[model samples]
Target: VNAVHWFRKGLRLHDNPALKECIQGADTIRCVYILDPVGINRWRFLLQCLEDLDANLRKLNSRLFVIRGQPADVFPRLFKEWNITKLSIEYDSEPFGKERDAAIKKLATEAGVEVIVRISHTLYDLDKIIELNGGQPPLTYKRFQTLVSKMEPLEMPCMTPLSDDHDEKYGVPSLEELGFDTLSSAVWPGGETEALTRLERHLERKAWVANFERPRSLLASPTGLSPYLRFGCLSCRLFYFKLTDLYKKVKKNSSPPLSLYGQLLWREFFYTAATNNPRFDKMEGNPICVQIPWDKNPEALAKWAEGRTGFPWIDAIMTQLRQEGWIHHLARHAVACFLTRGDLWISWEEGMKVFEELLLDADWSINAGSWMWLSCSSFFQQFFHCYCPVGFGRRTDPNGDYIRRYLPVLRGFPAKYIYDPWNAPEGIQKVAKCLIGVNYPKPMVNHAEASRLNIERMKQIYQ
Candidate 1:
């Protein structure tokens, strides 16, 4: 008589096929979303998404039972409490989710309940897609794009509750009870409505798809939907559906709109890669990428986090990250290159932690892929290349327009010197109220030295 829905990352019911199946045969359904306190503060956007999941369930005459703890322990306990007979959920291919699902399955079996899990996240059905392409992961987005572009698309089920319409009630644990070390302030708006609104805005007001391929820099910035995608606040299926419709409707003479859909395919590709090769989770993506010695300079890292890096461009990006848990795609490239070009020894995990804290759209696939590229561990490896921070600013920001907006410390330092405040004459630095090494830490690793170390160290990786 009762159907239980176990939600992990896939939070919406509109495109959620499993929820439809749950609705089909049950007299009453109980919607349950659990927050695994295990992630703690690391996955900020994910946690916010979970909370949004709670808000979303409220819209469908239902409230989420927020059980916090190990899910293996939580599910069986909830079933025992509710005497639930049927459970429907989706399969998660990630490392931790797979193990957790197995544990939950055993618990459900012991409780004598039936559970059905479906494939909802990716475009193609899991095995068929993997089989269609064979077992090897696609190394380039082009190949992956070809696969998703041709596949039959799944439609978001209509007039369906985005939550279970249940008379049954479930409890949400307080943050204190959940054992979260901190209840971090979330920057991105949470809940299903906001997700839908963002989707609409991106297409209508944002005009994000206008010119994407020219590089993430020259464009009007990304759709800023990564957090939404990452958290399932925005369903990839809906994203593709709307964008594909637009893509089809574009004027035949118009160049193809570089919509956000390509980025979604990229996410799925990385997921497929990591799932196919578990070693990829730890792999720098290079057979020859050797382990470079790391320097854990907490102070250097502190400066990086606080936007105290003397390089104005680096500070500009970090400052943006700190103020708004995001930076433009181009900004990410500029900052990431600086670190690899500078530290020559900082590990990916270091960048991972810093980014995880602030970036709402951070994905393991994109994050890992990007880091590997910079570390010279992947096909894009040019780790030893000197990305002259000063020169980069000259080339990218040019008139210091972007710099003036972010680093006010150099706002008045003359547009010419805003990108390289330290390069400004002594009088200009004083007028700008900036003391190069004091106000902002000096560029710790010289770009020149970093270039040499990067090449020599990376060459040692495969040896």
Candidate 2:
């Protein structure tokens, strides 16, 4: 039989159930990926992943067939051209992917090819989770946790190493060939090799992994595995199982809120929530989202997106995000709050779009879910409790080292005025060589007044 294994998110060979199934007694097997538009960082990382996957496949005497067309158009031609008798793919749970997969299944049926789909992207079958939870996704983390706690333990990851011909026509493309000019080295290099290495390094710190919490120190925190997880260079099941074994070794009865496993469940939580909602990415007509009359200020939104918000903390986080494709979870909270409810009054949709372009770890479900929560649009309702862009960053990084690293212009300022550079005296500003209004833009809006007014606006909307 001739078989085709479609590679979308699941980019690795190890623990890939679908890819394993596609390799069973097949005369000729094709591993394929359809090209789609993404930001430079994402494109670069994806290329790295493809390179790694191709190398691994070469070990098994095969290679990745990189195609540059929509799946609807590409797959039909591939099925006929390759004489494919079977198709295997990782199951996709997102709304768009679900629709696309259904259409592809139709085409495969028309071509008389047997299709095998496996759940590898997520830890649990999201449909079953919803079914167990009264036909609706759990709305809160605690609720989601409560629901899952009752379910059976997760299945161990399928360790099916891929068992390719080198086709020059379907070779992986370079950054320039993909229409991206810049070729800077990535801060977080992609691929399953890097992913597994990072995972092992973190697991080595057994005590730290056992006590891992979500809202920790902003700097030098996080496992740095998000981009890999997002690209599927790292399998969630593999990570989950590894964490489980580590937890067993470290603590007898490790649980949520402090465990690394909780973090994976959080990812699962968002995927389940968004799977059924077509409008999960937007506020309009989204059943779970609260409709707010967010201000339409293109200028303000631009400042936030471009890291010129004038709040040093918010600006630094934004700058770091633009330069590096990743940032800490708490940093995301600070900037997202500033962009939406705290100051600019822009819609979360605007901020989400910017993040989609920059963040290496940006998944459709989690990105939208986080934006909605941070903006107080959905899944969270603490509108009155807003993040002070200055105080929040100052508390975590009192010396302002994080600020200096990202926004070098504010480097000369003392610790006191580093977060709020405008508050420094005239002599101090000159000494720092950065004028408040001239060198760095003034705070886009008066935070004290803006936050007060925004809170009142949020209150009115709630009422």
Candidate 3:
């Protein structure tokens, strides 16, 4: 029997349940990756990931069949040419995936091909989690954790049985080959090999894991695992199991909501919420979201996106995000707060799109869920607790090293003025050779004033 395993987010060979099922039940196993029409902004990482995936599969006596075009068109044609009888994929919860998968399944059925989908990306099956949540979406992490605890335990990852032989040859395409200009190089290059390598290195630093907590110091950068997990280059279950074992050993280790396992739970929480709420990405018609009169300030939005918001702390983080396609979680929190009701009073949707385009590890559910939390539109409601772009960064790096790293224009400035260049006197600005509003822009909005105004507005909304 001929069978095809359709790879979407799940890219790696180890611990891939669908791939395991495909190999066990079929004599001939074909691996396929469809370049969907939408979400092309993520092509840079995808291309790198595909290259890595192809390399690994080639070692296993198989290769990735990267077919460019909508899956709707590609699957039907592949079925005819390859004489495939079984189709398998990891379950996708996002709206587009759900709709597209449904259509693909229909096509597979019409072609008399059996379909297999496994829930391996997330810790728990989101669809099942949502169903157990009483037909309502999980609005809080507490609620999500409670429900998930009642469900079956997370399954152990499965092993792959390398296929003996396959004569079909398929080539992986480059960015230019796919008709797109080359994007900025990835900060975290893709592939399962590099991901596992980095993960092992991180695990070796048991001290870091022992003291791991949120609001990490500026020097304590993230593990840089998101992009790998996002592309399925790293298995979530494998990471979770490793971390849980470590957590059990460390006496001083942080616990959930801040622990390594907490990160997995957060990912699952967002998936469960996104799957149940169709309007999870937007404010309009979203029952749980708090509607605010957000400004349509495109110029301000553009400034924020370009990292010229005149707040060096905010600018630095945004600059890093654009260049690296990844940033620390708290750094993300800082910029996100500055964009929403905190300063710009813009919609979280706008920031969500920017992250979608720029972040290598950006997932639909996590991006939207984080924006809503930072914006106080949903999940979190503390609009009053605004992040002071100046104070927040200062606490992490009093020397302004992080700001200088990204915003080199302010590198010569004194540490005190680095966080607030606008407040520097004329002579100080001259000595620094970066004048506020001239060499570097002045503060876009006074933090004290903007935050106070935001608090009052939030009060009015609540009242």
The C-alpha stretches of model 3 lying farther than 4 A from their native spots are 37-41, 158-169, 179-185, 207-222, 250-260, 381-384
Deviating ranges (above 4 Å) for candidate 1 = 38-56, 146-187, 205-223, 252-260, 283-298, 341-343, 379-386, 459-463
TM-score, cand. 2 vs. native: 0.94
Q: Which ten residues in a row have the lowest lDDT in candidate 1?
A: 158-167
lDDT of 2 by residue, 227-344 (tens): 8888788899898887777776677655633345677887899999999999999898999999899989999899998899899899888888887788898888888888888888
lDDT of each: 0.65, 0.84, 0.80
Model 3 over residues 1-463: C-alpha lDDT tens digits?
8889998898898889988888776878878887654234467677778888888877876677776678888888889988889899998988767988999999999999999988888877777777787777778887877777677866677122343322232567777766776565455777788889878876766546456654434432335688888888899999987876667566534443334567678888888888867788888987777888888999999999999989999999888878777788888889998998788888999999999888777788889988888888888634436668989988889999998899999988999889988888999989888878888887788888998887787779888
What TM-score, computed on C-alpha atoms, does each candidate reach?
Answer: 0.82, 0.94, 0.91
Ranking by lDDT: 2, 3, 1
Better of 1 and 2 by lDDT: 2
Q: What is model 3's C-alpha RMSD?
A: 3.8
Q: What are the per-model C-alpha RMSD values against the true structure? A: 4.9, 3.3, 3.8
User: Which predicted model would earn the best TM-score?
Assistant: 2
Model 2: lDDT of residue 137: 88
Best by lDDT: 2
Candidate 3's C-alpha lDDT? 0.80
